[model samples]
Target: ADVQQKLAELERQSGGRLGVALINTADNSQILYRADERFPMCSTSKVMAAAAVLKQSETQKQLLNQPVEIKPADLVNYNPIAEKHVNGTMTLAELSAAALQYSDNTAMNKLIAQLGGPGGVTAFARAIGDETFRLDRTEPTLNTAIPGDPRDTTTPRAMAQTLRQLTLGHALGETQRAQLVTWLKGNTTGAASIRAGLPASWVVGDKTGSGGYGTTNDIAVIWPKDRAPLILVTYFTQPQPKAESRRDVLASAAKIVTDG
Candidate 1:
């Protein structure tokens, strides 16, 4: 099949393991490669964490504008924006915005902490119908783990499914879904990955995750003109030393799906 051929070609040309899940929402068509294989989600876990917080806000009648403080101990290396704001205060909404929009590690750590830890995030994932994924650690710690680490792992298909639920309003109400979509659209990181392969006219909202060597991923919802949007989840891991190469692999995967 064309999908199989594409996967093989990607593997032959890329530096590490690859997992892809491209779902055409209009017709429910899919192309999956090692979609069930577990891999670290890195900062991608923030999406799930954000969903949990959103769900909590809805269920508890919690206010997004409630003040939350960031302590010095909570601050982590990398993510200059969050680091500069250490010992600062922001609302839950603002924290989530930083986490999703910039992939800020410090902001994510705060969210995870607010959600009552990694176990809380895992519970949310399971509540949303994921069975095999795990969320065990926070940022910076998660970045140092191996590919198959127990901390923050998920399959490409699972990530795609989560996106489907979120976009379809199954995970959050219509209003909440719209809000989350806005945050996803604001993502400024990994612009050269899946977003690069898409036409400028298309509407794309996505989240990206990256860790040590060979780990680069992007999960996105792309809306073509006059058609329903589709979800594309690409996860690549394997001693990949060049950051650009990993992004090229992601861009190529997006091109194959968009072209098909």
Candidate 2:
């Protein structure tokens, strides 16, 4: 109840929209605020897309080993990792790393196609019982957070639940699921957000998403040094133009729940 009280205070402090889904997997205690509201998936959708890839590999032998040729034209503006491999090829597994660890836009587009487009990602989620996530477009285009537009959106409850299934539940095969965890653990992003709020002694595996209208998000399956795993999902969207991203919001929320 303390977590709930603190989170509600945050929602009041920030007026636009705040969706938080926190699960103490140790006790199955969940704190959700506005968690059912549809928020833009942004780059965060890459996690689900990557999960779909690995889950597919369980049936298709050596599918992750399959190579995808990357051309210069395939890249988008923010593909820092894909830009380096524009003239070469990377395996689907490598692309998953690039997408999850680096949030590489081009890699995500390719992975999406590998799975038969946005519908495929959605289908994977549904097959696993997550009906809250829907991917209607690819990156860049998917980042547009038009008010009331339902395309490419998900709820915090759904995201946290999905992350639980993929990481600690029965979604993907053992090795396949561990690979996703490794990529998220190696993520270069999210240091200044949720990671910062928690004690550095703990370990965090996370994916972050950003888009228009001050949307900044982070989802993680964190392991405290002495506690069971916890899943945290924070989705924020400020509907004002020229609004600055309050990444600190993520940290403060993290601080409250972890009792930092």
Candidate 3:
């Protein structure tokens, strides 16, 4: 599509590689560029981790209310939520909110531990038909986002596909789906990414990512006034001495998707 070529201009300006995927939910139209290639997930992957907890609750029943015992070791840098609860306890529901809505590293690790570890969260992705998503490490570790090390990565297309499934594809129950949407809408992280490109009247729910080597990402579900919603995913790696701003990289990408 013409959109693909325009994206290349942004990539050239960024002095970095970019992977992107866009979906028009109403028509199933898509534009994919390097969309199947691996990219470090960073905090963008927390949305799935939060959904995994909800999936677990399907069987555990009381899973959401289950208390999470916070530990000293659980605290990691950038832990705005869980650090406050250290030496105490927070419910699973509370951690999910902190993790998804705030991108709280400590909150995510605690949720991963409750699910039995990184592998458990990975299993949840597979069960929901997302074979491309994987979480090999917890926060701080996964945040490494080192180049060439495909430790914890997912393709942009897979991310968009799975996100569409979760947000609109009946992959979760009604109430559960709404919860994820609520957290995503309340996300305090991505005001300058995908949301930056959208019009003021549109509705947006998103999760953001940041990491080493200038990696940055954002996944979003957007409703454009009277039109049905669309899903957009972008992952950028800007390691050059003079790299493009993330704001320009993603905001431009979103502009292309919506305008096209």
Candidate 4:
């Protein structure tokens, strides 16, 4: 377990409390380094919400291009919601693209709300074997309805499972799974995390979430030419000033993995 030991040492060096989960989806196996594990999915959970919508669309036999109207108020989750989707001036297709391409929080909230809320997404999670971890469907307001008890969420293992299900095409059916991967490919946020360690040509698809007071978490599927795809998830929390160092902390984790 030299790889595990090196990762553990790196976590300790970050000065911030850290946790990581890695998986080889091809084999359905995992490796955990350190720190507490909890659901605390935050926006990462939207991956499920998006999957749920795609699943529903397939079941209803609707094509992806079928247009649906969106209004400006629906873009509530974004820091500064985009004008295109905010004014009800965009179609559902555009909103979906925005949600994935930009990690547009407003787009995600709208998608979750339209798919019959977080509970529906949770149902989708349960069907695909995520029963033990609670996946929160963040609203346009973000944890506004329920205050979270950090201890009651999920672990890095659970997060890895989420990606496993996606990569394995078990979270959604074949067609929907393909669509989900397309959306994931569009994911551009959190590049400084799991992807920061790899070469420019490597294709990495991952989602990242952050909480106040230094809570940061990332889960990813790494695609490399020689090695099998690697699933890596890391979470870290530090004291103020140090708390904002997500790029530094995650870059260290990525280096440890790549070097190993």
TM-score of each model, in listed order? 0.94, 0.96, 0.96, 0.83
lDDT of each: 0.82, 0.89, 0.87, 0.64
Shift in Å, residue 23, candidate 4: 1.2
Better of 1 and 4 by lDDT: 1
lDDT of 3 by residue, 1-260 (tens): 68878898888977788999999988998988889999998898898889988877878889899888888987888888888888999899999999988889999998888888999989989998999998999887897777788888999999999999999878888888998898899988888999998898999999988877778899999888999989999888866533434756888889877888
| Candidate 1 residue spans exceeding 4 A from truth | 240-245
RMSD of candidates 1 onward, in order: 1.8, 1.4, 1.7, 3.3
43: Cα error in model 2, Å: 1.0
Mark the regions of model 4 whose C-alpha exceeds 4 Å error after superposition: 25-29, 66-69, 77-82, 140-148, 239-242
Give the winner by lDDT: 2
TM-score of 4: 0.83
- What lDDT would candidate 2 get against the real structure? 0.89
Which candidate, 1 or 2, has the higher lDDT?
Answer: 2
lDDT, candidate 2, 1-260, per-residue tens: 78778877886797667888888999998878888999987888999999999989999979989989999889886898888888999999989999988889999999999999999999999999998899999877998887788999999999999999999998898998898898999999889778988889899999998888888899999999899999999888887855678778888788887882
For candidate 1, the lDDT comes to 0.82
Off by over 4 Å in 2: none
